[PDB]
Design brief:
CATH architecture of chain A: 3-Layer(aba) Sandwich
Subunit structure (chain A): Homodimer.
Largest sheet of chain A: 8 strands, mixed
Strand order of the largest sheet of chain A: 1-4-6-5-7-8-9-10
Oligomer: homodimer
Pfam family, one (chain A): Abhydrolase_1
GO molecular function, one term (chain A): hydrolase activity
Family (chain A): Belongs to the AB hydrolase superfamily. Acetyl esterase family.
Number of helices of chain A: 13
EC number (chain A): 3.1.1.113
Chain lengths: 345, 347
Amino acid sequence: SYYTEENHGPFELINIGPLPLEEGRCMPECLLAVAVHGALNADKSNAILVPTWYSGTSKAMEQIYIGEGRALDPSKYCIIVVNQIGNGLSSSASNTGGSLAGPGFANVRIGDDVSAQHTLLTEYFGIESLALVVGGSMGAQQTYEWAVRYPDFVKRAAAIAGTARNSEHDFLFTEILIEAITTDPAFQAGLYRSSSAVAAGLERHAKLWTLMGWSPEFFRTGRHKALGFESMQMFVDGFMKRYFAPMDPNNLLTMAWKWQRGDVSRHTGGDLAKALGRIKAKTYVMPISHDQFFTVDDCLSEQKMIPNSEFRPLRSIDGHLGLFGTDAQMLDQLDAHLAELLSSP
Amino acid sequence: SYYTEENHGPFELINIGPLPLEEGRCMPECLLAVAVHGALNADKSNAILVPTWYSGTSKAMEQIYIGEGRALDPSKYCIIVVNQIGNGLSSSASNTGGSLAGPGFANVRIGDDVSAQHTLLTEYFGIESLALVVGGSMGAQQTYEWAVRYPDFVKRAAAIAGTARNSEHDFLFTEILIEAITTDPAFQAGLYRSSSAVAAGLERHAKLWTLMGWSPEFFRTGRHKALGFESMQMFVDGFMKRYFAPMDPNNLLTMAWKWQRGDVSRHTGGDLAKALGRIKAKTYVMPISHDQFFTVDDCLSEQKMIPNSEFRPLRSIDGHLGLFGTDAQMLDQLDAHLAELLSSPAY
């Protein structure tokens, strides 16, 4: 009941046909849930691709980032928001039959999403280049993979709060996030009868996201209170637990495995400088100042490897989950940077 | 067999007598495990008290911080290292009988340790003031409590990587650490057959410490490899899991409960500025730059409320567990700050 058009729509389900996956299995049919905002011009020069992030859907990207006086303005651009494979709206553990059902769903990599999106854009939209690819966190992982895998296709790229190659510390964080779910016996090796049977694991998952998803300064200065939650307990229970409670464990695990392995250097034998050296897009690297796990240092290290790129950190004590749109001043910064990027040749 | 003289000694067990605890229970006899390094001078004016930190013992403070070339030099100072109530050496769930055994052990607060330490110093050693109180993390919590509770007694205070009133974020971290242990079915509500039976909970606890105890920069720049571990997997297994593996779950929960509730403002009805304003000790507030949960910003906000004090962050990408002595640059900075502190004129 969570993954519906009534909650996340409108979107279109587009069957892009069979999808051979990097890990070796083939999806007989890959359905991508796509939301399109704005019209494509005759040059097809105004398309923007927006990948979705961990546990997220196209509806979040639309609610937080897209609109009239925003950088992502559908009166000027054709903004194409594409849901991750495994996110519950596109083909996922939760909505696919046969051998891909539930814990049978394949291991999907960032590169598989980008490959599917490329097929979608060329064959269903007839688009041969993107004015901008922009995403946050896992959405930034896909942004980097686009810029490296199809370098002449991507004219501009904005990687918000995410890296091109995942760190060992981030891998550990996600492993602990996974174990929060899989160590709940009600998970039943993915064969749980309903999402909510795994409430304990989903709550433990939410508590870890509270610990790592914001920042110590967020809580010290009472940001949670400004958002309407009088205490850490109220914030954990009223915001964080409630966010994850209706979601599907198998889907979260599909996206967590994928997030763990984001690595554009797979194109270059593990040489990251060589992969990032391939980027032709005008690229803004935009970590959030207080992000606890995609750090300013992590992202600056990569930016130095991307030719013609710019380092444009967002200042927000809301840290990583400032992506959720809790900090309007952060959103204003982001809009100014993105408008400047879109304005550049 | 982890909590022995063979592993953590030499130390002496001193019975300081009954200890009425803040939470309301009375310990009929409180034994403190104490290690002394160096001799007291003629008027006992060279005593330095070193409390121990979460999961730690006096052995760690000795190995990492005490020695002739160092600020805590036993050829000049009498350095008295006192093990936390609950840490397995002093009176704890793992070694106390009667109604205090195992799951029955009382909820002990930072203030109970400081009161017990004060009784130890005055009644057993005849010491009536301290040249320095210094500790890290939970050791820093006890340091602040000392400086607030007995302000004339403490001539100098050095609070490394810890705060005077615990934050909500830190409380959540420790709650998650506690649940890593208590959700292991083998924990059996504190009635586990042995430490070893609760290995799954202890390993999850270790993984959480790996996540929060160092820093992303520590790993990004390959510090774990410099320390001799080929990969994150080898570091987690060979350093972090191994550290917690032999420890007692009930003792860790005692120290965790205590850590969660460190709060010197209990002396002043919740008014932290009033509590910290009581401090007369020359005080250095020394967060570790890349500490993920006792942040530079957390400690700065408290330092601003302590009169006479100085803010001296330790620069280390090793973050919180740089307390374990992994970062020799950080130890060198600390020695320099502590030597400067110890040279402040006696009033």
